[PDB]
């Protein structure tokens, strides 16, 4: 499923990502745009053999099992295929585990590069939330 910006903002709010662990809603919409262009089925293979999955490009070396990744750790205890659903439930749940570490949203390169230090709330303006 490919989300619109405000459609995803509304879905992320329903999934409890407004103000989760100190991060406002816009952070998550901004992250999704630059990671996956709002596409739940996005995949990206890395040189190291790991793959990024879903709307937030969550990596198989650390977070999910894809059966293909060398020193994979499966911290979210989920098949990576679950992160591809049009239902964003699993991506959100795994994102919340990731962000509950002291690294916070710094786990996502696209977020550090494109979102951190910007007016993130701009990502949720114009939306009937």
């Amino acid at each position, epitope marked *: 499923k490919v989300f619109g910006r405000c459609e995803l903002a509304a879905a992320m*709010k*329903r*999934h*409890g*990502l*407004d*103000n*989760y*662990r*100190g991060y406002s809603l816009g952070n998550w919409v901004c992250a999704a745009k630059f990671e996956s262009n709002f596409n739940t089925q996005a995949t990206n293979r890395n040189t190291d053999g790991s793959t990024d999955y879903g709307i937030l490009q969550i990596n198989s070396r*650390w977070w999910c099992n894809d059966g293909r990744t060398p020193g994979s*750790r*499966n*911290l979210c*205890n989920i098949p990576c295929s679950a992160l591809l659903s049009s239902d964003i*439930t699993a991506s959100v*749940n795994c994102a*919340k*585990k990731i962000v*509950s*570490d*002291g*690294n916070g949203m710094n786990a996502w390169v696209a977020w550090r590069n494109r979102c951190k230090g910007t007016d993130v709330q701009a990502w949720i303006r114009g939306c009937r939330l």
Partner: single-chain antibody
Amino acid sequence: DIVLTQSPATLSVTPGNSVSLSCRASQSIGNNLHWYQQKSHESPRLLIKYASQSISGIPSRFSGSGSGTDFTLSINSVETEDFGMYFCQQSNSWPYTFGGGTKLEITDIQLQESGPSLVKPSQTLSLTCSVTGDSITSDYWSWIRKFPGNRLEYMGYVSYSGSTYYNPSLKSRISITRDTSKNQYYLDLNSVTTEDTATYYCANWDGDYWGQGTLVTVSA
């Protein structure tokens, strides 16, 4: 801190009847409200996560609803096995906090706590959790305690970077550490008082795997 208020405090019900347990929050927490069942001194069992999401192996009769500040656990036709305490827990904001509980009256990986059963005021309490079945580097790890009047307190957790989160109520007396080579992680609580008399639990941060709990009594 987020205060979670549960009502009713106690409920009596006949099997086959349905019940609704309410949890309200002092501030908005989105969908970040989880439900536990706890039976007279065993570890809590996670029933519903994120307000409405089903947990594998949990019976169909349990369902959750709500959002923001208002939440409900529903039991669609209660069975005798459903007796126990029911606790809500929020995960929106550190520190995680539990509701006060509702007494319902009806008319792979393993964790093992070890430590002293009796400690003296002002000594250090040291606990070990031994993890079987997976490496400790593959999850986040928590400590939780239950005070004698059924009150639950989330003490802390350590995550993948080694960053720790401690309940501020513990005022810097707590330390959580790991030993990868031993597959153990630890709780140290300094300068204990009789206020630290509790049953202590280790658990993974996900709330799926719990130790059995260990009662520690602080006495002169």
